[PDB]
């Protein structure tokens, strides 16, 4: 249609609020103050296409996974109501994170003020994915140790809310704070080292390794490090400027890594409930 027509522009002609990654030389959407043109742009080829679909698709994948999990027969749970509530909080944080991300990446080029509002929601979503993911994990690890379980939930909440309050700062969105952003979220996620150490110094090195928790927590740590390292350093567009504009740039890979990370985190706590279901809800040991 001949309505709301636009062409991709090079980086140097973008306004300062749109300039973010200088290694993405061309394929930029121009400032378009129309949500009609913004949502319509989803079907077009530009820097944001990959960022958008990885989290638009990821959002509906987790929406389906979330619904399918709530309709699981209550036979397969020890406490089906509270066990569905902890899984629900993870899926909730996972859906909100992806929703805010694909929405931000879509409306990004609307206004300087629209991008300021949705960028704050984009950062807030990440913190919600991290807090929500801890909920089922602490519930299963510290099952017959309720007192420490609830303490760690207060800790991650206070750190998660501090992350949300810091992401509402204007200087946080500036490209000079790319590493600060990666560090704030990386530290929040890596704070799981505290309950992990408690788990291994209470249940032992044998029980933590036999159940797979150690090997699984190492893979998660790797995804956090590799995802932050890529995002902060801008690899590989730093090495091939102008060659990774539409595909495989650091932000797009980090997006892929979020849905991949959230899926393997679900697989971990999914095996933690399967294991608890076999042993029962009792406290014999």
């Amino acid at each position: 249609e001949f309505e709301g027509r636009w062409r991709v522009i090079p980086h140097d002609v973008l306004p300062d609020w749109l300039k973010d990654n200088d290694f993405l030389l061309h394929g930029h959407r121009p400032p378009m103050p129309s949500f009609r043109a913004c949502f319509k742009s989803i079907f077009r080829i530009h820097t944001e296409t990959g960022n958008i679909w990885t989290h638009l698709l990821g959002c509906v994948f987790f929406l389906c996974l979330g619904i399918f999990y709530m309709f699981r027969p209550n036979i397969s749970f020890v406490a089906p109501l509270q066990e569905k509530v902890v899984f629900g909080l993870f899926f909730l944080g996972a859906i909100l994170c992806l929703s805010f991300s694909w929405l931000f990446h879509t409306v990004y080029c609307h206004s300087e003020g629209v991008s300021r509002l949705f960028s704050k929601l984009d950062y807030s979503g990440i913190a919600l994915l991290i807090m929500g993911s801890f909920v089922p994990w602490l519930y299963y690890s510290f099952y017959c140790n309720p007192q420490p379980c609830f303490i760690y939930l207060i800790v991650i909440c206070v750190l998660g809310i501090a992350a949300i309050i810091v992401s509402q700062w204007d200087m946080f969105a500036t490209p000079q704070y790319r590493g600060v952003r990666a560090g704030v979220f990386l530290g929040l996620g890596l704070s799981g080292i505290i309950p992990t150490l408690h788990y291994v110094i209470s249940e032992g090195f044998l029980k933590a390794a036999t159940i797979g928790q150690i090997g699984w927590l190492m893979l998660m740590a790797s995804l956090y490090i590799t995802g932050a390292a890529l995002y902060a350093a801008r690899i590989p567009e730093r090495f091939f400027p102008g060659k990774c504009d539409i595909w495989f740039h650091s932000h797009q890979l980090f997006h892929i890594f979020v849905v991949a990370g959230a899926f393997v985190h679900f697989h971990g706590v999914s095996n933690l409930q399967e294991f608890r279901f076999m042993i029962g809800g009792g406290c014999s040991e």
Partner: antibody
Amino acid sequence: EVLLQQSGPELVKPGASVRITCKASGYTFTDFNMDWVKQSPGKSLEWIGDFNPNSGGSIYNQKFKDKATFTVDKSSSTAYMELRSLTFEDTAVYYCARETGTAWFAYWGQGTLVTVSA
Amino acid sequence: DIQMTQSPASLSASVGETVTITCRASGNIHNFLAWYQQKQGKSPQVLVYNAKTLADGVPSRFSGSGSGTQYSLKINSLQPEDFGSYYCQQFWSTPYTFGGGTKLEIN
């Protein structure tokens, strides 16, 4: 600095055909679209059409479809607008304007005055 | 076609005064509006694009506002160089249309 340099004034007979030159400089020619605007004496601006130096595609205003033709020389970075079978109504200042993603014009040629005299 | 209507047709205001030129569209143009100034015998110059964004070099005196079909260009503290013909343009749909113009005349 971006610079759109247009051809000099023309004084043509009725029925003849003019060709306006638009030398673009100071940027990568194919990155943006080029538009053509007509300004009748003491009158408002009128859009003739847009041209894409990269694809070749050009969208004309229905009013001028049979009157104007947009052509290009990518090598010299020069846009052309050819007006066919001129009439007294065609006596106007013709500008070339560059787009910047969306069709708003930050860069304008100095204009070419086409005078149809008999 | 989208008819762009410009009002007032002309106005004369003293230096230091605030003036408002309005512009209407015959249908929604989704903020894809631009304002241009034109000095006699000179090429037009963009002032405001995307309804409210000020172009580089343009002073803060110029202020773009509006939404949907009704738009405005307010000039605070008029200066002797502000004389000329003002034009609004929609770039939402083809053919891109301009307003008739407003002739501003400083005295």
